[PDB]
Amino acid sequence: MTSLEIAIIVAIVLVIAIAVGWYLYTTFAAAGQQTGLTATKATIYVTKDGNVYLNVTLVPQGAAQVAISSI
Amino acid sequence: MTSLEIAIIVAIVLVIAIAVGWYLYTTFAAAGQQTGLTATKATIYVTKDGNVYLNVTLVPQGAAQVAISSI
């Protein structure tokens, strides 16, 4: 087909290819941030007056600021 | 044919040829401006008070001012 046609088709083709490629990149960058909490040490402490409190040690697995909902 | 005829025919022929040639040029110049958006980084952010906002990085593919319709 005429070079005009190859011009049009290559333009649209390149736009679509770049879009999909950097879509893959962004999906990878979002999947790499999957995170979660893990505990390495926990011993509930109790005082003489009845006050209790948990003294735990956390380590965030991943690269993010995990949000604690409830204990 | 008589040079009168060749004069007439070459005039009309040259007009038509120039018209079609610069038609091809203008079609190429219009096809070269095919454009589109592409994203390279996107991470939705959320505040403590519930306000959310997307912080994306855009790069226009092509040579034009793309118009965003909806997200």
Numbering used by the authors:
A (entry chain F), B (entry chain T): 1 to 71
Quote the study that presented this structure, word for word:
We present in this paper the structure of two additional archaeal T4P, one from Pyrobaculum arsenaticum, a neutrophilic hyperthermophile (optimal growth at 90 °C, pH 7) and the other from Saccharolobus solfataricus, an acidophilic hyperthermophile (optimal growth at 75–80 °C, pH 2-3). Although the full spectrum of functions played by archaeal T4P is yet to be uncovered, they are known to mediate adhesion to various biotic and abiotic surfaces, and play an important role in DNA exchange, intercellular communication and biofilm formation. Finally, we show that Pyrobaculum and the Saccharolobus T4P are at the forefront of virus-host interaction and are recognized by two different viruses, likely serving as primary receptors during virus infection. We show that whereas the N-terminal domain is conserved in all bacterial and archaeal T4P-like filaments, the C-terminal domain of bacterial T4P is unrelated to the immunoglobulin (Ig)-like domain shared by archaeal T4P and archaeal flagella.
In contrast, the sequence identity between the pilins from P. arsenaticum and S. solfataricus is only ~18%. In contrast, ~10% of the residues in P. arsenaticum pilin are charged. Interestingly, and in contrast to the S. islandicus and S. solfataricus pilins, P. arsenaticum pilin has a 15 amino acid C-terminal extension that wraps around the globular domain. Within this extension, an intramolecular disulfide bond is formed between Cys139 in the extension and Cys80 within the same pilin chain, which is likely to contribute to the thermo-stability of this pilus. In S. solfataricus, we see clear extra density consistent with glycosylation on seven residues, all serines or threonines. In contrast, in P. arsenaticum only a single density consistent with glycosylation is seen, on Asn55, which would be N-linked glycosylation. First, although T4P of a neutrophilic P. arsenaticum is as hydrophobic as those of acidophilic S. islandicus and S. solfataricus, it does not possess the extensive sugar coating. Instead, T4P of P. arsenaticum is stabilized by an intramolecular disulfide bond, a protein adaptation to high temperatures previously reported in bacteria, archaea and their viruses. Consistent with this prediction, boiling the S. islandicus pili in 5 M GuHCl failed to disassemble the filaments, but under the same conditions the P. arsenaticum pili come apart. Interestingly, Iho670 adhesion filament packs very similarly to S. solfataricus and S. islandicus pili, with an RMSD < 2 Å, while P. arsenaticum packs slightly differently from those three filaments with RMSDs of 3–4 Å. Notably, the crucial N-terminal subunit-subunit interactions in these four filaments are almost all hydrophobic, except for in P. arsenaticum there is a glutamic acid, which may contribute to the slightly different packing compared to Iho670 and other archaeal T4P.
